[PDB]
Design a protein around this ligand. Sequence first.
Ligand SMILES: Cc1cc2nc3c(=O)[nH]c(=O)nc-3n(C[C@H](O)[C@H](O)[C@H](O)COP(=O)(O)O)c2cc1C
Ligand code: SF4
Ligand code: SF4
Ligand code: SF4
Ligand code: SF4
Ligand code: FES
Ligand code: FES
Lengths: 230, 41, 54, 212, 66, 59, 430
Amino acid sequence: SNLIEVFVDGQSVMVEPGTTVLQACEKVGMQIPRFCYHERLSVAGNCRMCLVEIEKAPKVVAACAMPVMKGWNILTNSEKTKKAREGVMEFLLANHPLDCPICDQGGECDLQDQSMMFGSDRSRFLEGKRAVEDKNIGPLVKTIMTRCIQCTRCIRFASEIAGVDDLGTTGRGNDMQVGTYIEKMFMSELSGNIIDICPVGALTSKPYAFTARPWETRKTESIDVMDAVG
Amino acid sequence: NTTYKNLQHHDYSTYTFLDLNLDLSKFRMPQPSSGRESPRH
Amino acid sequence: KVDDAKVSPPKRAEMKTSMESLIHHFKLYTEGYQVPPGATYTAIEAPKGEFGVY
Amino acid sequence: ALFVHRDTPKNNPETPFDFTPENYKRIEAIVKNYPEGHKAAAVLPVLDLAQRQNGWLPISAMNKVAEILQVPPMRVYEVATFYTMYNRKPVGKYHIQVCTTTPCMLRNSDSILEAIQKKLGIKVGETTPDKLFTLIEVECLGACVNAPMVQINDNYYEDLTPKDIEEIIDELKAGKIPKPGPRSGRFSCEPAGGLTSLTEPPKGPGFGVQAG
Amino acid sequence: PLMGWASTADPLSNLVLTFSTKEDAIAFAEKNGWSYDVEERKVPKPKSKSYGANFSWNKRTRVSTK
Amino acid sequence: RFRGEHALRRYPSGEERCIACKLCEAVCPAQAITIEAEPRADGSRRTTRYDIDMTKCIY
Amino acid sequence: KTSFGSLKDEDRIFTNLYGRHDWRLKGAQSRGDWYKTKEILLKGPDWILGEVKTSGLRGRGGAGFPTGLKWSFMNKPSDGRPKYLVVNADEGEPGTCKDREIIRHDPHKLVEGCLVGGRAMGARAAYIYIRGEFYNEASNLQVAIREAYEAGLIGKNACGSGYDFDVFVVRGAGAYICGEETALIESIEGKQGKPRLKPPFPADVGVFGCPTTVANVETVAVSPTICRRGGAWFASFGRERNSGTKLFNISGHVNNPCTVEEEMSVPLKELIEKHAGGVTGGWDNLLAVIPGGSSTPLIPKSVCETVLMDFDALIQAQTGLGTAAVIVMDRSTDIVKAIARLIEFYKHESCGQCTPCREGVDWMNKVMARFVRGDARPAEIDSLWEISKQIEGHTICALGDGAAWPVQGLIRHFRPELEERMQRFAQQHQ
Ligand SMILES: Cc1cc2nc3c(=O)[nH]c(=O)nc-3n(C[C@H](O)[C@H](O)[C@H](O)COP(=O)(O)O)c2cc1C
Ligand code: SF4
Ligand code: SF4
Ligand code: SF4
Ligand code: SF4
Ligand code: FES
Ligand code: FES
């Protein structure tokens, strides 16, 4: 009754019609890596890590926004799947400079974990590594847009949950600032909620900015106060 | 007949395009709407 | 050493120059390289004897 | 190219900029072409109108467009950053755009660039030491069958050479416009040689048609 | 008071035990004889969002920027 | 290549070469390194407290 | 059959090619527009679609898909949302020179063709998206559609129908990827130039969500003669896998480069010399050939001596087939320099949705600059082959793909001249 067959590495599982391939593959357990898909957001097409080969096909589709056709059989661990991932991961680490000590998501990046688990052991490409003057947003959010990967995730959060429309992609080619064109203070509600979303250390907290590191801390379950939601 | 039949276009100021589609706005089927006029109302 | 930066740290020149070497350096020393699960046993002839580790 | 605004008065709103109710009549034409419910498509032609209403567009122009078209201005700033008509920094009245990438370099745009360089004086991308001769060079326009070419504000100059360079320099110093026509022979895109192309004046409508 | 270190009288405050189910968790916790608090495995919401549905005609699901 | 004294260095006529990036505690096996890092007044990131236990250090 | 020959007259599409005879509504009426046309209107679009799919029409614009299959996608059942024909009047791909001449001479052919297309699929309106670099001939198009307006012949009561079909013109704001298939659509929408992902198709979701179709202006301009002429007369021009008269133009470096209309299969050397002067300094004075345009790899001499101008035969020659930069370039200067300028072009005009074209065009530009200076090592140039293998098939649009092809072709054919360049740089550094 309205389910679709897919094969994740040959294994059959049943699909509600209209979902993405990425949702089914993380239904069966395969945590396919990603940089712009986000479950609490709409789907852009900028991550490019979501590529995966499916057989009987000349080329490789994106698994982020592909509706489930009938009877799939996906190659999540083929040769050219890992070759495409090694490609994209080698591309991302060009214009993201050597600030991994002085980062603020140093324990909790995503280029870190996914480049250790998918990327290349050696790199190439001596020159390049372009730089951007950091903008200002407000004295609550510290903003270093050199480490930004232009992944268009802050923008979707702004124009959906904030709706304030302050963040913009300006420029072309390589040079594409994610920022406010007019140096206007983005100081409204939920402006503090963007920092758990920018997956690199581009957007970060201002008072916390240079204090500690995630491994030394420890988590503890707790309840919000001062508000009726908790 | 080897005559440059063009350069009727020789006399375009800055306003000719917008004003041509302006002056040729009549007899127009009215470009139908869809509910709202924007995302918001 | 081995030429497998996902096991050993890179050398210091490629560390201080390029990017992936720095990331592998940093999270290799912090996070520690992952090891696949399983049990093993080995031993060498230490001059005492069969020094084994499980 | 310095896409942070860096307010710099002679800019930095309020900057004086306003329209005409006749230009409002133009805006009525623009949002009457587009179907209702998707009004946000008029940002591109209204900002086109703003550039042809004032030479370089200020930030207050875009803010006024946001004030008319009832959208927040950041999308207007995006569209102004992306495209290549909208020289946001103040330029002169005329504006030289030497179209030169692949066939133009191949047919000596270097001589064209150096001729403009040594008669106007200034380098690439710079402003002239007056107004109204600001020089840049640009990508292809579409007359790759022609020579290296020069676009001035809404006008062509095709099929150039250093004597045409001297012509266009001295005659835009002569106030008026010269013709935009293809210079130094071949008065359009024309086979000026053996000319094995079509030689018959047209057939007329009533030749062999079908399914009538 | 000499170096500014975090010192405590807590031997068992560095424990974690990794399990695979809840029944054996409760069984071991009472097997060693102590009270305990059980919580929920709060799964994510099952969604189905797509690119063309984000690019509709009349609906307000309209990203206005991409 | 002898291993000795545990000194901090600095730049050539410059600031403290440490950044408080906590790697030395992250790999210090006896965990003798204690780091607490305030940023200083001039915006750059720095320390408060960088401690070694010579009792604990295995060199 | 023949052995595919060349072209003789009346196989040509329209008169007034090169600054010639006429332009007016009366000029177009005297040349053949608006003739036997309501009898095509009141017949049925399945007949038009069968004639399109029978006439062997190849989709111009560098996509290769035949048009009748795309328009068969366009036959979605009728809903509460209209269907549109977008006419992609941009001239991207430096070399193309294509419909600037069409709009300079015969806009009423475009009127005929958009009438054919919108009548072919239950459509409602058409949108000419012109390049913003074409302002004067854009207002020529405005005056011509004004002549058709005051003709009482388009729009409401087109020849006596109760089926109206208007065209609106949108200019470009000045970009390159607006030529492409869907950044066009979101540049129409008011968003900036940004393409779209594939599974929502233009035949499914297009201009603001309504299904629509982007059509090349050559296919639109040849489309009304498909209606008013005989059944698959256009199919008798070339093979039975591809068909049609193609607008073969020599940009670049010959004696007096210019544009001709020819058939499909023509010998390339005879195309060059018999139609635009000749090769300067002798036929053996060439360095190489590019067919296709700015987005097609180079072809050397000995390959194209036997291989003449065919789609599938240039696929066999490991390239594509496109338009109007079917040029040679000279042994005087360097195709290394020219391709470096080409990569500078692709860098200065490309959007940055896909990370691979962004970062790859960055590396390839810097590596070509070091090639022109001769700086690098041969391992780097075969790694450039490696990265260009890693780009082709990882994007949204095809502009990174069109960046990736020419460096592959250059690494195929002109390897040792690059080697000697690097060798003499090692001497000068030495
Ligand atoms: C790099 C690139 C440049 C393009 N430039 C143009 C252009 O200048 N004009 C155009 O009509 N289509 C352009 N296109 C889009 C395709 O040619 C598209 O197929 C065409 O608009 C319609 O082709 P069809 O008639 O086969 O449907 C471009 C596409 C790419 C990838
Ligand atoms: S966000 Fe950038 S600087 Fe921070 S850890 Fe990741 S790659 Fe390094
Ligand atoms: S600022 Fe962060 S969330 Fe926004 S595009 Fe850049 S990396 Fe993505
Ligand atoms: S925290 Fe430790 S590893 Fe990091 S810079 Fe300071 S001394 Fe070096
Ligand atoms: S390949 Fe480049 S220009 Fe094309 S859609 Fe992707 S990011 Fe844009
Ligand atoms: S999820 Fe990032 S593009 Fe598919
Ligand atoms: S590059 Fe100058 S005309 Fe195309």
